[PDB]
Design brief:
heterotetramer, A: about 10 residues, mainly alpha, 1 helix, about 0% strand, B: about 230 residues, Retinoid X Receptor, two-stranded antiparallel sheet, globular, binds ligand 244, Estrogen receptor beta (chains B, C)
């Protein structure tokens, strides 16, 4: 979740 | 990048105003915790975007970006709460549709405690007449200073934001002596934000362990990742 | 009262170092907790005396004096520990003959974590080359800023000490800008201190409930008086 | 006790 939002926009 | 330009980019990184889509009505215990957790979850998504807009943040190792966010989120949420509540003595403006009073904070055990902490700190910022640009730097610093190669980058960034807050204070045109006193008074309040943050986490974690609050993945992750 | 007089007064107010002897045998979870609690108990007594020496402190209401000490005692203890360990990286000097190696934090369940953040903040303080006069001011600020007419008298006492910190930094001779920057770098560390303190007291309460070490009297009164 | 050290000592 956190990691996916940090790697995408 | 000058302090003024860095401050401007923070303004641009500001997350949007968030609402929980709740029809105006009295607050009970279940509806209050449901609203607070639902609100926090929505704000957490915007907080990630916000951080990535901070110059250099995405340049940090993924390990740092994650640790910094997992550790400061509650403080950042509370700093946002206090800036929204500044022009409304006695009230905590969690959201336009989630405005709470101290008494209403008696409907939930252990929360009146924290509301009082937040209201006092908010009152304190109001007395100091915290300016929007100062709020921006302070909030950014909370994220970059929660650090209990990539390291150099971090210290560099933290220093840039610190330079920015010093600049904002210098523009107010007050004496040098009063610029230092103001800088200290603002930074000394972070201890209180951190304190009210720790209690807020303890309380939320307890609510989670009791399954009294709906499942919010991003919020559950930020809670566990941090508790641990 | 000029800043210098205030600083000179804190210098005189400094408590004497509590001498506690390291157990003859290698530490065990129990012997280590025993030394830490016994040491803390003794320093808490001197801390009380030290607080009464801070200009204007005794002038606050009795209830304020209690609240301040209850909320910041561990922070103060830890600020002291860090200062004592400043010139000894990888080493935490709890007392003259009670030097703990970072690794020894293994015989105590969950304390290595705290030891690490303590060593970390200490290195930061070393990196900044914290000075004795700065240290004295900061420690008093920790006590006076723990607000976690007497209320207005507290804000005034905190400003005088802050004003004294600003004076000490100025007497270092660095540019006005770097003075602001130094002041910021120092105070940003109160958050880390306040954090380590929150973990330290939680850890202590846990060892007590765990029956790992006996916690009573002053120590117990200060411990409960914060989770309260 | 904390009160004692504050007021009695
Ligand atoms: N008050 C208090 C402590 C507190 C306790 C709790 O169990 C849940 C939440 C959620 C938020 C919250 C949500 C959104 C914000 O913007 C700020 C705080 O604060 C909380
Ligand atoms: N490390 C750590 C956290 C910590 C945990 C605990 O269960 C007991 C103590 C006592 C002190 C202590 C005692 C005297 C000092 O001067 C400073 C810290 O720190 C402690």
């Amino acid at each position: 979740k956190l990691v996916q939002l940090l790697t995408t926009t | 990048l000058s302090p003024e330009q860095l401050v401007l980019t923070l303004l641009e990184a500001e997350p949007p105003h968030v609402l929980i889509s709740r029809p105006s009505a009295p607050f009970t215990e279940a509806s209050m915790m449901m609203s607070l957790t639902k609100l926090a979850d929505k704000e957490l998504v915007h907080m990630i975007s916000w951080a990535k807009k901070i110059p250099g943040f995405v340049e940090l190792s993924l390990f740092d970006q994650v640790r910094l966010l997992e550790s400061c989120w509650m403080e950042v949420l509370m700093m946002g709460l206090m800036w929204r509540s500044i022009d409304h003595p006695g009230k905590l403006i969690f959201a336009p549709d989630l405005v709470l009073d101290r008494d209403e904070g008696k409907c939930v055990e252990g929360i009146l405690e924290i509301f009082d902490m937040l209201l006092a700190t908010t009152s304190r910022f109001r007395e100091l007449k915290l300016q929007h640009k100062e709020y921006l730097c302070v909030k950014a610093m909370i994220l970059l200073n929660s650090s209990m190669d990539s390291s150099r980058k971090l210290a560099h960034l933290l220093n840039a934001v610190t330079d920015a807050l010093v600049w904002v204070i210098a523009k107010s045109g007050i004496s040098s002596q009063q610029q230092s006193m103001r800088l200290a008074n603002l930074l000394m309040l972070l201890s209180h934000v951190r304190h009210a943050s720790n209690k807020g986490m303890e309380h939320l974690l307890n609510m989670k362990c009791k399954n009294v609050v709906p499942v919010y993945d991003l919020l559950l992750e930020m809670l566990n990742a941090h508790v641990l």
